[PDB]
Amino acid sequence: HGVSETLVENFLSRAALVSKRSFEYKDDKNFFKWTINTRSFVQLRRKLELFTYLRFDAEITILTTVAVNGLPDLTLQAMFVPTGALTPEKQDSFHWQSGSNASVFFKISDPPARITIPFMCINSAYSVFYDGFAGFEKNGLYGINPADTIGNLCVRIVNEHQPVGFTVTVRVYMKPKHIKAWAPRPPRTLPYMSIANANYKG
């Protein structure tokens, strides 16, 4: 008939760019850290905010671009730090050799690094919208569910310091998969004012 293209599994599972950031390389202290959310780009934000609850596994693809300020062949580490673990604050911290954090070691010359992050909530779905407060007192933040935090994706260059200085652009592509979706919402008609909230200007 034709209904198999407006399936929510087909409507939402597209590997869209969720994070693009360059970092430099000399003696985010020269590494990549990204809090895995979906509100970074408004084209993907508005599609997922057509729903109230979502349950998906994420499929992170990491695409590394190098350019020297003759390209070297470099090892990168991309560590997923879930909510409960500790992120690196430096390039050479001890958290990069965590036994329990899921790291992936890949090269520039390789095909792009692809991992699947599971469903990470303590509830049965991620609240896209949260009519509630995170803190147990009045100083809590509105619209933030503590259950819904995926974790952080920390990317560094494993190699020690080199004579040349280069820029490493890390493009992160997330394809949600096994999407279940509940309670559809009206689309947003006004522009977004912030990633923290649903404020509107007119």
């Binding site: 008939h1 034709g2 209904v3 293209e5 407006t6 399936l7 929510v8 409507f11 597209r14 590997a15 869209a16 950031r21 985010d28 850290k33 990204w34 809090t35 959310n37 509100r39 970074s40 408004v42 084209q43 508005r46 599609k47 057509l50 729903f51 109230t52 609850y53 349950r55 992170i60 693809t61 695409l63 997923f80 899921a102 095909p111 692809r114 991992i115 699947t116 992050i117 599971p118 469903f119 990470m120 303590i122 509830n123 049965s124 592509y173 394809k175 279940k180 979706a181 509940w182 309670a183 559809p184 009206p186 689309p187 008609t189 522009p191 977004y192 004012m193 912030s194 990633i195 923290a196």
Partner: protein, 232 residues
């Protein structure tokens, strides 16, 4: 070993591929699925829910002025109240609807629409409207007599305050040279608005549109609707 050879397209990242990758965290059991009400399995379920048209498509109508057409004494015996150009794509009454927003994620739409018009005057307000449907390529009528020669309906809202208008199967993206013209739904006065002297002499209509079960959407694109302050 196994003798292999690599193909063209090896080690490429096509963004629309469906391959099993590696679990970052195996042996982690997620939270089990519980029943949450109102599960969406198909975006055509969303499109078949009726939503308000901005049938007050005039200039300088702002906000909730746009959602309703006022019928009063200033509307004469056979004046054109509204017309609804049936472009889902273009900036009309159908733009900010559920059928209008979810269709702008797709390139080709096809199917039958339905328009519900709801009369929101007083109980004893009487009168007749004439809701004509203009097929694609035909011209929008400008007189009440031209409207009663087409596919129309003569709606006495004296006690029936709802009329559904089935718009027949279109095929949507088959009529473009930029979406062109998909038809019109106009409304003319047949009688005057007859109200008692204690009811307000200005009554209002609201219009709805949903897509029917034969509606279809294909070739997915991005929405032109959306175009940040405050993770790194």
């Amino acid at each position: 070993g196994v003798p292999t050879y690599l193909l063209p397209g090896s080690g490429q990242f096509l963004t629309t591929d469906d391959h099993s990758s590696a679990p970052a965290l195996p042996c982690f059991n997620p939270t089990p699925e519980m029943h949450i009400p109102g599960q969406v399995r198909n975006m055509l379920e969303v499109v078949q829910v009726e939503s308000m048209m901005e049938i007050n498509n005039t200039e300088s109508a702002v906000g909730m002025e746009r959602l309703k057409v006022d019928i009063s004494a200033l509307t004469d015996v056979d004046q054109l109240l509204f017309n609804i150009p049936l472009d889902i794509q273009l900036d009309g009454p159908l733009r900010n609807t559920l059928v209008g927003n979810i269709s702008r994620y797709y390139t080709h739409w096809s199917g039958s629409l339905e328009m519900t018009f709801m009369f929101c005057g007083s109980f004893m307000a009487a009168g007749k409207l004439i809701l004509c449907y203009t097929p694609p390529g035909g011209s929008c009528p400008t007189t009440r007599e031209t409207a009663m020669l087409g596919t129309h309906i003569v709606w006495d809202f004296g006690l029936q305050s709802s009329v559904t208008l089935i718009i027949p199967w279109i095929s949507g993206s088959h009529y473009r040279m930029t979406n062109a013209n998909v038809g019109y739904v106009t409304c003319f006065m047949q009688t005057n608005l007859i109200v008692p002297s204690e009811s307000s002499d200005t009554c209002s209509l609201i219009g709805f549109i949903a897509a029917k079960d034969d509606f279809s959407l294909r070739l997915m694109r991005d929405s032109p609707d959306i175009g940040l302050h405050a993770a790194y």
